[PDB]
Amino acid sequence: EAEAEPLDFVVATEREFEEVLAISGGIYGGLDYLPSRYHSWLRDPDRTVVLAKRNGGVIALESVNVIDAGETVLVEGLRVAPWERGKGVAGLLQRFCSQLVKRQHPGVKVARLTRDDQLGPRELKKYRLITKQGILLVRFNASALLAGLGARLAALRTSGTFSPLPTEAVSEAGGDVARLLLSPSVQRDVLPGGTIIQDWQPYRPSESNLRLLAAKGLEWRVDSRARPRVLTLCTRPFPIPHGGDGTWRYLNIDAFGSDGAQVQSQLLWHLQRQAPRLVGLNVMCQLFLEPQLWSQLADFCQVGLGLELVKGYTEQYLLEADIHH
Ligand SMILES: NC(=[NH2+])NCCC[C@H](N)C(=O)O
C-alpha cells in the first residue's frame, strides 16, 4: 500500500499558514505558540521553516534556526499531522533538515532542543542533557487577579505569611542585562547550566545572542544588580488557541536562581507588570524554575495568590547533540 505521491520538502511561505494550522490541532494542550508566531518565523534571517508535503498537502513542519554566533542550530515546532503520524514522517523531515543545515551552515557544531516529555533511554543515548528546569503552570483571569491582589497581599503581610522582598530594576537599554548575563559568575551560579532559557529557546550567554534577545520585548527583574542571585525573565504574552474563544494568552516567566523567596517576589512583580495589559483576557502562566523551588512556588501561587494549578510537576529538558558532517 505505497502512497501514490511522494514526500516533498519545501520552504514554508505565508500561503501555507492555514494548511499548517490544520495539522496543529491540540498541540501542547492549547498552549501552542505557532499560530501566533508562524508569520514572524518567516521573517527571521537565520531561520528556515520546512514543510513536508504529500500530493501538495502540508503534513509536517520543522524549523531550524542558527544561533550562538553560528555554532548552534535550534530545532523547534516539529509536528506531523495526526492522520500521518507513526509512519516515520517526523524522522524523514528531521533528516532533510539536518542535511540542509550541514549544507547551508557548515559552521554549526551542535543541535539543541527543549522538551517537556520524559527523557527515555533513546534520548539519553543520542542527546546530552545541558540542564533542566521545573515547570509550574497556573491559570487566572487577569481582571479577577487585579481586583483581588491588594487584599490578598495585605492579608499575607498582616498574617505574617508573606511580605514581598525588595527587587531591583533591570534595563536592557541601560546596559544592565549585559552586565548580568555576560558575568562569568552569574553564568556559573545563576543560569541553569550556564544557559539562558527564554520561552523554551536556549541561548548561550553572549553579546551576539543578547542582540537577539533585545528585539523581543522581554522584561527582566533581579534581586540585586550588585550581588545577583535570582534573575527572572518574562516573555511578552501572545495569543494561544486554548479555550477556542480567542481570549487566552500565554505568559512565560523563566526564573534563574536558588532563592525561592526572591523567585516569589519577582514573580509577583512580573504579574503586577503584565496583568494590566491583559485586562479582559485569560492567562496561562508557566513558570520555569530550579526543580527544588517548585513546591514552594506552587504553594505560593495556590494559597498565597489564589491561582489555579493547571497540572502537576513536569520538567523542561535542554538537550544537545553533535552534528555529523
Ligand atoms: N508545551 C511544550 N511541550 N512546549 C515545548 C516547546 C518547545 C518545542 N521543542 C518546540 O519548539 O515546539
Author numbering: 47 to 371
Q: What's the publication's text?
A:
Acetylhistidine is synthesized from histidine and acetyl coenzyme A (Ac-CoA) by a histidine acetyltransferase (HisAT, EC:2.3.1.33). We find that HisAT adopts a double-GNAT (Gcn5-related N-Acetyltransferase) fold where the N-terminal domain binds acetyl-CoA and with distinct active site conformation allowing the binding of histidine in between the two domains. Our results indicate that HisAT catalysis occurs via a ternary complex, and the ternary complex is likely stabilized by the oxyanion hole generated by the residues Gly123 and Leu124 of the β-bulge.
Arginine was the amino acid substrate with most activity in the substrate screening without an imidazole side chain. The crystal structure with arginine had the substrate residue occupying a very similar position to histidine. The size of the side chain and the differences in hydrogen bonding disrupted the water chain that was present around the histidine side chain, so that some of the water molecules were displaced or not present. The substrate binding site combines the preference for aromatic and positively charged amino acid side chains, making histidine the preferred substrate, although we also obtained a crystal structure with arginine in the substrate position.
